[PDB]
Amino acid sequence: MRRSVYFCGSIRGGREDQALYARIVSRLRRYGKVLTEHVADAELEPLGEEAAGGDQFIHEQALNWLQQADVVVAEVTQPSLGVGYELGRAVALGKPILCLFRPQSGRVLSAMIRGAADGSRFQVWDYAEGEVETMLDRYFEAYLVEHHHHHH
Amino acid sequence: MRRSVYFCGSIRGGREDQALYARIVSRLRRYGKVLTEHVADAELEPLGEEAAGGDQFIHEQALNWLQQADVVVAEVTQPSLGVGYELGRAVALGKPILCLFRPQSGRVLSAMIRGAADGSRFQVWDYAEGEVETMLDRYFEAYLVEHHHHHH
Ligand SMILES: Nc1nc2c(ncn2[C@@H]2O[C@H](COP(=O)(O)O)[C@@H](O)[C@H]2O)c(=O)[nH]1
Ligand SMILES: Nc1nc2c(ncn2[C@@H]2O[C@H](COP(=O)(O)O)[C@@H](O)[C@H]2O)c(=O)[nH]1
């Protein structure tokens, strides 16, 4: 009834991912529902439990969003440890995962990542800078035309 | 009845992880059962299905081993994308996870990784080169003395 897409992008406390997150959030919300909202909130909602929350909460928030997230999509030009972990949980929790790696960033996907992309429900596309939009448009266009993730 | 510990280490087709894998395999097997055997086999068992197997098989082999692996232990000095993915699956599939990061390697654990270590069943210890043995000895000694992973 309701589709939810979770975006996975390494921020590392950077201000170069927020711009991408704001633009990707609007595109993901247009289809059904978009998560990864924490990386775009200029008003940390106060009140609640008076404890030392932070990193532990970060992991808990991502776990709760993936529960509803019917599909996961990632956009990282370099091998991110934190983002890689999220991808692993997405495959174990969900099924249809997406990965966007820049084929001209300099780095490369390790054996574990390459192996993960069996072709069933996990697809790893290569986007070269200005090609990120093409990959996102093709991913959303191919998803609507297929109406599922069964084809290899 | 039978305990199985799966070791997680970034190899990236390198010959610097095999030496560590051989020494860690013996220590892990001494306690109960050790996996990550693929990274130490000089005799690829032939025969079987005649297909293009490789990366997909790598991911499938790790998934099958974690099923029996009651506990997971990792030893990486730098943020590894492939290894990070395995850790995510270990927390989603199992529960008691271990992480060994070098506090003098140069890099650092991202927000996702730090958050993952809630202190419940996931413990991230810092080992400085020659301190890898100390972390492994304390991890195995603390596991036998506690007889479980409940303490925070
Ligand atoms: N749900 C959720 N995800 C988070 C939070 N903090 C970081 N993340 C996710 O963790 C990733 C960033 O990992 P890092 O850049 O630190 O390696 C991104 O995919 C981002 O969405 C948080 O508080 N909640
Ligand atoms: N079970 C299993 N694990 C593998 C295989 N190939 C690589 N790995 C695991 O993947 C990790 C290496 O990832 P990478 O160094 O390529 O980032 C190690 O933890 C290693 O045990 C394989 O064929 N089978």
Q: How far is CA A63 from CA A41, A67, A89, B56, B123, in A?
A: 19, 7, 8, 25, 18
Method of elucidation: NMR
Contacts for A95 with CB less than 8 Å, ≥ 6 apart: A121, A149
| A136, A150, B82, B39 alpha-carbon torsion, rounded to 10° | -150
The amino acid at residue A137 is D
Give distance in angstroms: CA of B80 to centre of ligand 2: 11
Ligand 1 in reach of B112 Cβ (< 6 A): yes
Interface residue of A63, A81, A87, A121 to substitute, partner B, most B CBs within 10 Å: A81
**What is the residue-wise DSSP string for B61-83?**
HHHHHHHH-SEEEEE-SS--HHH
Q: How far apart are CA B73 and CA B27, in angstroms?
A: 12
CATH of the domain at B24: 3.40.50.450
Across the interface, whether the CB atoms of B84 and A84 are under 8 A apart is answered yes
Shortest CA gap A67–chain B (Å) = 12
Q: How far apart are CA A65 and CA A47, in angstroms?
A: 21
Ligand 1 in reach of A6 Cβ (< 6 A): no
- The parent domain of residue B70 ranges over 1-152
Q: Among the atoms of ligand 1, which is closest to the Cα of residue A9?
A: 19
Q: Taking chain A, what is the end-to-end CA distance rounded to the nearest angstrom?
A: 25
Shortest CA gap B141–chain A (Å) = 26
State whether the Cα torsion B77-B39-A94-B119 is positive or negative. Answer: negative
| Total tally of structural domains belonging to chain A | 1
Q: How far apart are CA B117 and CA B113, in angstroms?
A: 7
Which positions in chain A touch B79 (Cβ < 8 Å)? 79-82
